[PDB]
Structures are given as C-alpha cells and as structure tokens.
Design a protein around this motif. Structure first.
Motif, PDB file in Angstrom:
ATOM      1  N   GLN A   1      29.953  49.980  46.849  1.00  0.00           N
ATOM      2  CA  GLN A   1      29.904  49.107  45.652  1.00  0.00           C
ATOM      3  C   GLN A   1      31.117  48.187  45.694  1.00  0.00           C
ATOM      4  O   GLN A   1      32.214  48.690  45.997  1.00  0.00           O
ATOM      5  CB  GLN A   1      29.936  49.929  44.368  1.00  0.00           C
ATOM      6  CG  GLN A   1      28.708  50.800  44.173  1.00  0.00           C
ATOM      7  CD  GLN A   1      29.005  51.962  43.260  1.00  0.00           C
ATOM      8  OE1 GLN A   1      28.412  52.095  42.194  1.00  0.00           O
ATOM      9  NE2 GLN A   1      29.940  52.807  43.668  1.00  0.00           N
TER      10      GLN A   1
ATOM     11  N   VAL B   1      33.567  45.517  43.736  1.00  0.00           N
ATOM     12  CA  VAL B   1      34.059  45.032  42.413  1.00  0.00           C
ATOM     13  C   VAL B   1      35.100  43.914  42.601  1.00  0.00           C
ATOM     14  O   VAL B   1      36.098  44.137  43.329  1.00  0.00           O
ATOM     15  CB  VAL B   1      34.612  46.194  41.573  1.00  0.00           C
ATOM     16  CG1 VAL B   1      34.942  45.744  40.157  1.00  0.00           C
ATOM     17  CG2 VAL B   1      33.646  47.364  41.538  1.00  0.00           C
TER      18      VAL B   1
ATOM     19  N   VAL C   1      30.139  42.806  41.835  1.00  0.00           N
ATOM     20  CA  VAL C   1      30.070  42.889  40.343  1.00  0.00           C
ATOM     21  C   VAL C   1      31.473  42.573  39.794  1.00  0.00           C
ATOM     22  O   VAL C   1      32.471  43.001  40.401  1.00  0.00           O
ATOM     23  CB  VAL C   1      29.516  44.237  39.826  1.00  0.00           C
ATOM     24  CG1 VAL C   1      28.550  44.876  40.807  1.00  0.00           C
ATOM     25  CG2 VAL C   1      30.597  45.232  39.439  1.00  0.00           C
ATOM     26  N   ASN C   2      31.545  41.813  38.703  1.00  0.00           N
ATOM     27  CA  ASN C   2      32.814  41.321  38.112  1.00  0.00           C
ATOM     28  C   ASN C   2      33.291  42.353  37.095  1.00  0.00           C
ATOM     29  O   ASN C   2      32.571  42.565  36.127  1.00  0.00           O
ATOM     30  CB  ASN C   2      32.587  39.947  37.478  1.00  0.00           C
ATOM     31  CG  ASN C   2      33.713  39.451  36.600  1.00  0.00           C
ATOM     32  OD1 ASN C   2      34.882  39.665  36.899  1.00  0.00           O
ATOM     33  ND2 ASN C   2      33.361  38.767  35.524  1.00  0.00           N
TER      34      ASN C   2
ATOM     35  N   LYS D   1      28.859  48.810  33.722  1.00  0.00           N
ATOM     36  CA  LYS D   1      28.784  47.772  34.783  1.00  0.00           C
ATOM     37  C   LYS D   1      27.850  48.228  35.911  1.00  0.00           C
ATOM     38  O   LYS D   1      27.950  47.646  37.008  1.00  0.00           O
ATOM     39  CB  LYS D   1      30.183  47.443  35.308  1.00  0.00           C
ATOM     40  CG  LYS D   1      30.731  46.111  34.833  1.00  0.00           C
ATOM     41  CD  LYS D   1      29.653  45.062  34.585  1.00  0.00           C
ATOM     42  CE  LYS D   1      30.120  43.629  34.757  1.00  0.00           C
ATOM     43  NZ  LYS D   1      31.501  43.411  34.256  1.00  0.00           N
TER      44      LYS D   1
END
Length: 290
Positions: A174, A176, A205-206, A232
């Motif tokens: 993942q 980030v 993802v932010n 998130k």
C-alpha cells in the motif's frame, strides 16, 4: 516489542531537571524550514532544551546525491551522531519547534531506527508545547563528549525508486503520500523546485501528515489514528510504503503506523522529487497537466 516512540514534555522536563541528560539520554532539535521563512539553527542557539544539540539535516544526508533528503552512508550517520555524543546504548529524544507540533523529528526518529537503533522517541507536542508550559529553555552551549556509534542499515524500512516501480505492478505494498492534498492532486505547485510539477504516483492514497496532529501539537490517540487509516481503506495488516516530497513527513505515517502497532512501514526517501525526475510520466498523475 516496540520501545517508547513518544515522550511527554513533563517526562522530558523531569528528566532534564534531574541531569539524566548525557551519554544515557541525548536531546536533538531537528528543526528545518524553507529558506527565507524561519532559521532553526539560530532559533535553536537562542533557546533549546537544556542540554539539547541541534540535528542538522543538511549535514547528515547524502550530499553526492542529486535528490532531496537522501540518507548518508552508515558511516556519515555514525560519525555525526557520534560527535553528538550518542553511542548505541543511549536513548535519543528528537524534537522540532515546527508550528504544527512536528515535521522533521519523525524523519530523524526513523533515520535513527533505519540505522539499527530502537531507543529513539519523538518529543510529543514539539518544542512548541515545551515553551507553551515554559519548560526551561537555554542559550547555554550543549557540548557532549563525543561517543562511538555502530550504525547498521535495517533495509526493511527503506524502499528505493527501483522497489517502488516494481510495486507499481506488484501492488503487494500500500502506497501513502503524506504530502498536502493540494499537491497529491496537482492543484498546487511544488515549492523550492525548478520544473517540478505536483501530482502523486499511480496508486498513492493521500494521507496528509497535518491530520495526525491535534490542534495543540500532540499526536492523536491510536484510536483516532487507527480510524484515520481504516477510513483511508488503508489496512495495517498489509505492507505499506510512505512517500513524501523528499521522504520526511512520510515518517509521520511511519510514527502513526508504529504507534498503532505496525513497525514495518518503509519510506520512499527519493519520494516525489526523485520519482518525478526518474520515472516515466505515465507512472504518476496530476489533476491539470495530462
């Protein structure tokens, strides 16, 4: 078996007020600010935690490199935290007087970890709250007898351009982006840079780092953090890399993740400045320019 990642000002205060600082306990001001804004070295020299040494990130980094915030050699590190009288038996307490509550200290907390050192904690609520309760500060020069530092690179915390590009297809990690949303999207420009578009990497993802910090400057209850992630659609069970611009506020997710019980968040240190410059344009996106 995770060591204290955070310490309270009250704890540090009582520790300082007890001459516990020295070869067993060493304090660092990591403060750095965008040219023409603040000056940490100055601000450090004017007031710092009684017996604090100033961690300079411009001097402890890989200067040969052409990317922002590269790790030095195990050597460059060991020599440096050496001259700040830090052995591997010592406990390191990192702060910065950034307004938010913290910005660089987690970069350093990490660096210290990625170099095989597990007694390091960030001082919670930064220099900010240290002052907000008037905990004694001094101009008096902290001058620690230098110490020898064995420096061992734990690789598992370090993801390289090469490994990120792989994960672009692999998807096993993942990804980030701790950068402010404005820039994860491409809306805002990238500051202190020449021909450097804003925009995140395909799949990023932010999770901006601001959002890990209460109004008062402290880090949030792990329940609040644990939400923040879940919410998130980010799973702590699953492998997780942190990007930044330069690989610094990415550590903020690392600290978060760690606090929650995940001590296996690696950091893309190249981050966006490296990625932007090395990667094909197709591996990264921006609302605006396409």
């Amino acid at each position: 078996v995770l060591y204290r990642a955070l310490v309270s000002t009250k704890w540090l205060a009582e520790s300082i007020r007890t001459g516990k600082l020295g070869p067993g306990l060493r304090v660092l001001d990591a403060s750095w600010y965008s040219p023409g804004t603040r000056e940490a070295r100055k601000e450090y020299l004017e007031r710092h935690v009684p017996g604090a040494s100033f961690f300079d990130i411009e001097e402890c980094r890989d200067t040969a490199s052409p990317y922002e915030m590269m790790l030095p050699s195990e050597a460059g590190f060991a020599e440096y935290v050496g001259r700040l009288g830090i052995s591997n038996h010592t406990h390191v307490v990192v702060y910065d007087g950034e307004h938010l509550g913290s910005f660089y200290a987690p970069r350093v907390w990490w660096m210290f970890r990625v170099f095989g050192h597990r007694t390091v904690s960030v001082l919670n609520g930064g220099f900010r709250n240290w002052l907000k309760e008037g905990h004694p500060v001094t101009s008096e020069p902290s001058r620690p007898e230098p110490a020898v530092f064995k420096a061992t690179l734990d690789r598992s915390l370090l993801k390289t351009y090469e490994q990120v590009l792989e994960n672009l297809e692999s998807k096993r990690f993942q990804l980030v982006d701790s950068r402010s949303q404005g820039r994860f999207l491409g809306t805002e420009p990238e500051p202190d840079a020449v021909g450097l578009d804003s925009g995140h990497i395909r799949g990023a993802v932010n999770m901006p780092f601001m959002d890990f910090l209460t109004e008062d400057g402290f880090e949030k209850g792990p329940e609040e953090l644990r939400a923040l992630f879940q919410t998130k659609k980010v799973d702590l069970s699953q492998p997780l890399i942190a990007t930044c611009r330069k690989g610094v506020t990415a550590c903020h997710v690392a600290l978060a993740a760690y606090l929650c019980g995940k001590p296996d968040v690696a950091v893309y240190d190249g981050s966006w400045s490296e990625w932007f410059r090395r990667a094909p344009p197709e591996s990264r996106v921006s609302q605006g320019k396409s």
